[PDB]
Amino acid sequence: TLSEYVQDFLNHLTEQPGSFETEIEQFAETLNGCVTTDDALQELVELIYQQATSIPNFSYMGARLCNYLSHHLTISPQSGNFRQLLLQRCRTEYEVKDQAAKGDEVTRKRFHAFVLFLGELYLNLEIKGTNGQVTRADILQVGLRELLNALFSNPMDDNLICAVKLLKLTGSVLEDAWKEKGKMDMEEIIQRIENVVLDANCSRDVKQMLLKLVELRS
Amino acid sequence: KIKACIDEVTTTLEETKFLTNKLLLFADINGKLYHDSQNMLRGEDMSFLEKDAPYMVGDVITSGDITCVVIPSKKAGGTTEMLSRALKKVPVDEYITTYPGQGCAGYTLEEAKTALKKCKSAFYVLPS
């Protein structure tokens, strides 16, 4: 099927990460010729999303691929382009972030991978403006803050470590974007983390890890 | 209980809809939406906006996730103080909006920004 051409390329990227640069152009050209339906584009999105959220170490590769397809796919269906359909799919799991963070261990694990894929998406996803084309996804900048808030609000070890990982990955970029706009989200984050250390019932090692973030971020 | 004006966006309507489904639109006393707010509509039923027209400056009309606030016209004498006061009538929440006083047949971008910043709600501002 057309779906299995995509999964084979995703599997190929997993096995050969270095193949991306030489094989990505051919992938886009083939998709431009065969993806002509709203449902076929929706399927392409779903397959990439599933690989990025269910397969380890595909967070970076998935996000890198999504950015490329967003500005190299020529199809523009009336229900939305690749970018729009992708973002709509993310909105689905994002809507229940508050519930996912307080779910069972497996639900939380799934949420963590979603969070870290969105973190890579924020870093990698480029958006062209009217005057300034060099911009990141602002909605993701906001979304990541809310995802962090959700994680600190359910201060279980795995949630907290997920937040640490996300802040190590995107923290510097978020810190610069917030400082440039005079926002105190970083300070809020630091205080929320401090409150976790003070009050939460999680492990001492996690708390010690959190304290070390206080040394780095401020 | 919600954030004090985070503001801004570059992403399109459907893209920004990832954050919230709540929209804040700007209307005149006749209940007719201003151009920027008219563009923000994607096939929603707007019959409810004429059902209670005409409106006083500061009147707020909500149906579902669509919010509408009656704003003063600068080309008809309206002041920045009047604009800010009308927006203070908006229930505190997270909204996807435009600049109220945009632009020709209204206030300047800086005056519209000031009124949004004076408000207690958190905004995601699309450009026009």
Residue numbers in the entry:
A (entry chain B): 78 to 295
B (entry chain A): 389 to 516
Authors' description from the paper:
SARS‐CoV‐2 and SARS‐CoV share an otherwise non‐conserved part of non‐structural protein 3 (Nsp3), therefore named as “SARS‐unique domain” (SUD). Paip1 acts as a positive translation stimulator to regulate the key translation factor PABP in the host translation system. In addition to receptor usage, the potential of a zoonotic virus to establish itself in a new host will depend on its ability to cope with the innate immune system of this host and possibly with its capability to use the host's protein synthesis machinery for its own benefit. Our study provides new insight on the latter aspect for SARS‐CoV by demonstrating that the SUD‐N (Mac2) domain interacts with the host cell translation apparatus via Paip1 and increases viral translation.
After trying many optimization methods and testing over 240 crystals at the synchrotron, we managed to collect a 3.5‐Å dataset. The structure of the Mac2:Paip1M complex was finally determined by first using the SAD data to position Mac2 in the asymmetric unit and then employing molecular replacement to locate Paip1M. One Mac2:Paip1M heterodimer exists per asymmetric unit. Mac2 adopts the typical α/β/α macrodomain fold. The main structural difference between the two Mac2 structures is located within the N‐terminal segment Lys389–Thr408. However, the β‐strand is replaced by a loop in the Mac2:Paip1M complex.
